[PDB]
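Appendix B: complex inputs.
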Amino acid sequence: TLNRKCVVIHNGSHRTVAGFSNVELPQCIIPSSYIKRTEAEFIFGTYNMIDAAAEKRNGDEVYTLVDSQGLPYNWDALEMQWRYLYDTQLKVSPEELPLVITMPATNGKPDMAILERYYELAFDKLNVPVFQIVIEPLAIALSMGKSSAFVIDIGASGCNVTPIIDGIVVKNAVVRSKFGGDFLDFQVHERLAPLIKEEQKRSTDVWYEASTWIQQFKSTMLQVSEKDLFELERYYKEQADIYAKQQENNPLVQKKNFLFKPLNKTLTLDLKECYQFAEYLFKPQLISDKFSPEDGLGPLMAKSVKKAGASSPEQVYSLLLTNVIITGSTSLIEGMEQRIIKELSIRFPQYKLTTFANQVMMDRKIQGWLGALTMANLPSWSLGKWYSKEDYETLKRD
Amino acid sequence: EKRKKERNLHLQKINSIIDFIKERQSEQWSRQERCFQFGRLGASLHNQMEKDEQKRIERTAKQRLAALK
Amino acid sequence: MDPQTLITKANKKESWRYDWYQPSKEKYPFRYKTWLRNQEDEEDILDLKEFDRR
Amino acid sequence: FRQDSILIIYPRSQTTLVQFGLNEETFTVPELEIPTQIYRTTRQDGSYTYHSTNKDNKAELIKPIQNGEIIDISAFTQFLRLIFVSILSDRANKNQDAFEAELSNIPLLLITHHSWSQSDLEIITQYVFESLEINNLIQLPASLAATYSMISLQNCCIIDVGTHHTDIIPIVDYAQLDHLVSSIPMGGQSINDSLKKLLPQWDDDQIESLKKSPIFEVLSKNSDLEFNTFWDEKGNEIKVGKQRFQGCNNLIKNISNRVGLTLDNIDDINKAKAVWENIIIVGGTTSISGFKEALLGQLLKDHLIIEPEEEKSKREEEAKSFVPTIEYVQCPTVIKLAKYPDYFPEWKKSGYSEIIFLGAQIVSKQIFTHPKDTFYITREKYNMKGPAALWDVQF
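Resulting structure:
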């Protein structure tokens, strides 16, 4: 390979994942938000932010750095986040090593400005000698071994479905949904609010809840219906009637108990209630009429496939539906992949769905970082566009 | 001519990045297996240092009768 | 003995530097610090048993 | 390799444990405890010459490690050179043919820290193979040396309570989660300074001697009697009351909050519980009796998953009209200390407060007594990549 050592920085919507190229696991997974403490103090890190939010101090405000688009929008504190990466975590000068950073799949418009921002961030602020921009649904697709893939990154900002054909991203069919982990952070906290006696500026308290026990509910108490939940109750009773007739019970009523840690209280929710939060990712009309089923994930599967067919469509359809890549931290819940399997096989029954997913729990949270990690270790610099300082200097001229 | 070179370089860039990642995918599987084995190989030397030092304790306990007389 | 000849008589060979490198495709428009191979043209002793615990 | 030529260096913030050669019958306590300090003569023209003593009061005292962090990478490596040459001279003074037997090929094992930089560890790789000319080098972490001193459990948790800091490290799959490694700046002096608050009429010497007294235990017989008398460093009898049972609670509560915030972010639920069941608390501080049991019991107090004692008692009254228990879904249901190696005689004699050194003797019996060079850089691998070959021999 090349005699090199690159810097891998992934700025997701909820987690800022950073590490080196000579390692396989990142140096740090800090959140993509910061407490502005009020003089202003931008607390970065995981343990520095959870401890400062457990203080519940006034003037503390958790402010995000990456919006729902997957784009950074607070570039000065993201610089201070990246200074917290290079100095406190990476312990290296940003000018010594090359950089590889992550971009979400877009339709084509907002890249050049954020590239110019990344020009202004790598060169004008860190003096990084060269930085490479990879596309995070593309980098996830190549790191699983595919130049043509159907990537669905279900993150905290929502579901990010991306059709990819032969190394290039089909940009007009890239759709970014809104219902993901932070939306599941909202729904879980809403229903348990009579059970926890609870029911921006107080986002110090809100993000602290979403990082301590709401993250604990989504990792443990949440189960996704592998059919639709109305279809799942229909399927589970018909099989249990076969089991009762062949030999000689409702699986919803299984009381899944949550010990709420700030109160020391059992939060007894049956399995349909655990199915209820994960239903809104695929039926967001179950909370409000303003959300169509197309705004949920299920019909947005077929919409992203059919728009990619007009990149001859039916071969593109069989190209994507046999190259399905499932990734994201919100996709780690039990039944996420089988629901995507069901909601897409009911919308394309002719094609056999072969869906792939990083089954490692940790590696699916950092698959955008692990996607950029494999691109950071390419043994030829002609394999990716390595933006030198000249590549900003040609952008400065008119 | 010029059209043959662009399609072949696109196929070469597609296949090589697929191959080099599959190399690093196998590099991911190879390094974790050595970490599993040499950790348990360290556990084997623990049992090796256990049985050598346990027979030393058992032999001197029987040889206490020689110290006793 | 002298602290250098205790080292050279022991442990019996290249040198390495942490240096900028510009790679070739010719030369790429950047550089980066890495561990480049050095080419051809590229004191006291604490007395022991003082820190011996007893 | 030859086991007498095996060198292990364990440098800390305060001291450095050195042993050259394995006893080959049983593993023994490290005899050499050198303070991690070098003497920097500011030589005219700007050069540095690094010394063992204050060279005519022109040298400044440079301790290159504090709170486990390397703060002077050149002064540390020359202090590594200061220790290594002192072994080279002593083996040339004791054996006089050691350069063909004991020094002809020396496998070096420097126990590294989690907070040491990648550029810092690579300069160590650059130093050992060029100036020290040492043909082989293991850069073993202090976390993995601790779990290889135990029975080599696959998932563990390291609590390295030093003198001024406590390193809280999760271990899964014999590896280190660097995104979850945290370190509070509260160590052995936090036990001392909390006794300064409880015993204001004493000094630092009487309280450190109280922290090094045999009557300093933590509750979770000394317990029955109210007052007890310990001895000073100068032989003076000093009486103390119930302050010998306290002073540790703030460090115990701050560790268990940092441990509980560390292992709750493990999304793999099966990996986290075996970490919770293998709590390892190490350090020169941790020689205090009852400190580990109360730190375990504080984890039982703050992070043990159980049905609440109000909710169990109401349901036990509802059954009085057999009690099945409420089954939760959260991971830390069982919290246990890891079982300590009780088969080393000399390490049972001198305590397991420095147990990180003991696993290095097992690793140097694992790697330096076996022909596999997969976890040490050879002379060939240094001539191939140099310090870029450091990231091919890591665990």
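Residues 73-94 of chain D form the longest helix (22 residues).
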